[PDB]
A paper describes a structure:
Nonetheless, we noticed that the crystals could stand prolonged soakings in solutions comprising sodium tartrate, PEG4000, 15 mM L-aspartate, and 5 mM NADPH with no ammonium sulfate being present. We further observed bleaching of the crystals indicating that the enzyme was reduced by NADPH. This procedure thereby allowed us to solve the structure of the reduced enzyme in complex with NADP(H) and L-aspartate at 2.1 Å resolution. The electron density unambiguously showed the presence of a molecule of L-aspartate with the side chain carboxylate overlapping the position occupied by a sulfate ion. The ligand is engaged by several interactions mainly with the arginine cluster (Arg13, Arg276, Arg416, Arg577, and Asn413). The critical observation is that this position of L-aspartate cannot be conducive to the oxygenation of its amino group which remains too far away (∼10 Å) from the flavin N5-C4a locus. Therefore, we shall refer to this site as an “entry chamber”. For oxygenation to occur, the substrate should bind more deeply, inside the “catalytic” center wedged between the isoalloxazine and the nicotinamide-ribose moiety of NADP(H). We could not detect any bound L-aspartate in this site even after prolonged soaking. In the L-aspartate structure, Asn62 is flipped “outwards”, vacating the space in front of the flavin.
Numbering used by the authors: 2 to 601
Amino acid sequence: PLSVAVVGAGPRGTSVLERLCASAPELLAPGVRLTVHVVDPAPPGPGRVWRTAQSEDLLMNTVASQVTLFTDESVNCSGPILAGPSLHEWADGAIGPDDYPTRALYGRYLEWVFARTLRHAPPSVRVETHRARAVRLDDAADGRQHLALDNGRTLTGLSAVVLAQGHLPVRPSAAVLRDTEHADRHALRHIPPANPADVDLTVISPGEPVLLRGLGLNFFDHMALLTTGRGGTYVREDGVLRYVPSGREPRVYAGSRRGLPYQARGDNAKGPYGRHLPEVLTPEAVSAFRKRADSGEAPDFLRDIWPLVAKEVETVYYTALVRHPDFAPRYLSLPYGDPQEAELLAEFGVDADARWDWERVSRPYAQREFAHRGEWRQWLLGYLRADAAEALRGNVDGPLKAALDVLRDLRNELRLVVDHRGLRGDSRRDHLDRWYTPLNAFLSIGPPRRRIEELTALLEAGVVEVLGPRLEVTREDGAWLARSPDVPGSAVRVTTLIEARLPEPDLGQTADALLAHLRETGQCRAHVVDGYTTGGIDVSARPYHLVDREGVAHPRRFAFGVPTEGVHWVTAAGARPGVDSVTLSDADAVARAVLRVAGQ
Ligand SMILES: Cc1cc2nc3c(=O)[nH]c(=O)nc-3n(C[C@H](O)[C@H](O)[C@H](O)COP(=O)(O)OP(=O)(O)OC[C@H]3O[C@@H](n4cnc5c(N)ncnc54)[C@H](O)[C@@H]3O)c2cc1C
Ligand SMILES: NC(=O)c1ccc[n+]([C@@H]2O[C@H](COP(=O)([O-])OP(=O)(O)OC[C@H]3O[C@@H](n4cnc5c(N)ncnc54)[C@H](OP(=O)(O)O)[C@@H]3O)[C@@H](O)[C@H]2O)c1
Ligand SMILES: N[C@@H](CC(=O)O)C(=O)O
Ligand SMILES: N[C@@H](CC(=O)O)C(=O)O
Ligand SMILES: O=C(O)CC[N+](=O)[O-]
């Protein structure tokens, strides 16, 4: 009887299984039975990231109304549209549409979507689940696939295998190994990169000096786990938050290279489905870029794409600032950086001090010097208060946060420009991966406003200190020494060093046994763009056949999501409703390819 396997039962594997069930009546012949084997060491639907047994202190970064695992009539795919509830609709008044759910609540939605998919399965499809890791994949003698699980079971005779493996562990860097050894010699705690939900922070004591190395979304999780996760609470008075200490908190120090907590997301005013529709990086502009990459002269990100992104953002900022119907048609007719930009702005009442400045938004401390810790702290509090107040105006009427939310909305169009070798390799390396991607995350993949208002109260209470720009950490007898070379008096000896970031996708350093096996035996390879090696596993165009060391696309193997980062840009994002989600149309295309390779 026919069999297939899905490796990974997080959102992407669950979505493949829902799309398999949707198309199986059209693409399997009458009377044919298909067994789908679903393999995850975590209960299926939520997988490891969204498991319901995690701490309720940890939040999503997406509003509840924009979280779904179901296709909708906007989605351009070949399988049938099967409407279901968003997290907000399913949650039955437990959460507001513009509020941020707990990660455990998304888990409970995902466990229910999985149980519902088994209830709605057509009679041609039997699902079998396996609480296990897959550790080897091989060709059988007839060309069907063998999948070996770490519980000693082997699945044989498979017509197809889908790898939906998401956020995988990585072997520690040389720096992470030196710091782990230093912790062993001096009885310290070193916590390497990980989902904050997976780390044991109960080993940190009250009053202990702790460095969070990182100021991004992992930082905001550890900030919550070491405060409200230890009996801390907040109270609001005259608009303004105050932190109420439990006495169990450590002394929290934090820093990074840029030295700033990530920007607050503007409060959502676009509803469940609202997206900035591009007027500079248009589908017409994107088609022309894809035509040049196709004919072998790929665009340069900095020369050719960045000026369109910059114009897109600046136009939205100025349009929200000027609020006159005639302004934007006149501004959009001007080329990016033309001298008439400045003169048109002056004519609509915009002074030189309200003008966009990419250098200031990137490093807003760089005009000034800091004489001691105290001057850094007062500057930083002023900066975070202004950030929270811009975010309260929302992502439609607030000019700054409307403009930075363009960067979140444009990801669809940037993916179509840069994915599948749409850039030259040297531009991919030096412009996208080393400059745009980290700036973009700082500006547009930051926390809810509430997290910036909490951090500000923690800074006022002295429970958190941010050390300052260009964080330096050195190993000493009995501690690490952390300082900012831009903030005199910032030096502090800590006894816990937390690397507050996730492992990035890296096939070359993977700690997954299955991909290490495929890499050693020449059955997968790193995606390469003109001599630049990315961290991504190489796949064909949709429906994403796995490509072997010699460049051969496998007919029975497909890989989908985070492990393809390099082929694809910003894979670490769920489906949104009403916007022709590529995550949903990719799941549908992968499911239909699996059913066609089985259904011969
Ligand atoms: C901490 C964190 C917070 C996030 N917050 C948000 C957010 O707020 N909003 C948002 O849109 N996105 C968020 N994301 C992005 C995330 O990438 C997606 O939401 C989504 O989880 C990706 O789904 P996936 O199935 O590709 O990967 P994952 O959710 O990582 O699921 C992969 C699954 O595959 C399993 N697996 C891997 N290897 C094997 C193997 N060899 N055998 C068997 N099973 C295997 C794992 O156990 C895991 O269950 C977040 C990610 C993380 C890590
Ligand atoms: N709340 C949530 O839902 C949540 C929680 C956690 C994770 N996530 C998901 O996971 C993704 C990654 O989160 P993240 O916190 O890893 O990344 P992130 O949000 O981009 O923050 C990474 C931080 O680490 C610093 N940094 C990065 N690489 C470093 C390195 N090699 N050495 C030292 N410092 C380094 C960066 O600051 P500099 O930039 O100056 O170095 C930055 O402060 C998010 O984008 C999101 O998709 C979401
Ligand atoms: N339209 C086909 C595949 C394709 O040719 O794109 C499908 O039915 O899935
Ligand atoms: N995944 C996209 C939206 C979509 O599903 O196309 C995002 O980055 O938020
Ligand atoms: O420069 C920016 O990014 C914002 C414009 N401003 O003057 O606030």
